[PDB]
């Protein structure tokens, strides 16, 4: 159970894997939203994503010019049928800040994040 | 170049074998015969369109508990893609990173090209 306790968040913020380190944190300087998703050729490609604070990191460290595919961090999954506690486990035990979520007609539901998972499980 | 193509590591998709996730446990363990930790593959509606696989095991201890008669995907566990043109020692490190075993290879459109295994992975770079 996921979707039946905690709703899923919806896919805002995509950004394409070719576009530049540079590009990136220029067009999206003071951004409210903390979750950008990386899509490959079609917005709907969702393939990873990004953390603005290692992308300035790796700029000043001259690393600018590099595409966001090739820095992010890999899309995983989790479904929409798996216990939270079990799915806390897993991301925290991974470190892996967010996932989509997808149900059993593989229909991508929205995302979820650890920190919105500890805030949940945290409030029982 | 660097080294091989995940794409070469990978069974290929028309030769992967996949099951209705909608077929009971009950028709699955009678219909299809494997061993015991085979992990088969599950599709939606689509062939092609595969969305996670299940441990025959837990198919059976679903089944020897008088839970036979759900569907496969009630213990349907999710699979991950990496991309195909991803550097195999890339791939090696995401999988490990993240504990995969099994993980299926996509083109840059998402499009399915196969099942990469870490222990073939692991095979070839050690």
Same mark, same amino acid.
């Given at each position: ?10 896919? /805002?913020? +995509? ?6 380190? $540079?590009?990136? *944190?220029? !067009?999206?300087? #003071? ?39 090739? /820095?992010? +961090? ?6 929409? $049928?798996?216990? *939270?506690? !079990?799915?806390? #486990? ?35």
């Amino acid at each position: 159970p996921v979707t039946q306790v905690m709703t899923p968040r919806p896919v /805002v913020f +995509r950004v394409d894997a070719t576009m530049t380190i $540079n590009e990136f *944190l220029d !067009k999206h300087k #003071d951004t409210p939203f903390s979750r950008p998703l990386v899509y490959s050729e079609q917005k709907d490609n969702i393939i990873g994503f990004v953390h603005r604070l290692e992308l300035f990191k790796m700029q000043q460290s001259g690393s600018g010019q590099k595409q966001l595919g090739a /820095v992010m +961090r890999p899309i995983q999954v989790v479904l929409n $049928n798996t216990a *939270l506690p !079990k799915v806390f #486990d897993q991301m925290m035990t991974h470190r892996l800040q967010l996932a989509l979520v997808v149900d059993e007609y593989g229909t991508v539901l929205g995302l979820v994040t650890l920190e919105d998972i500890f805030e949940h499980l945290v409030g029982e």
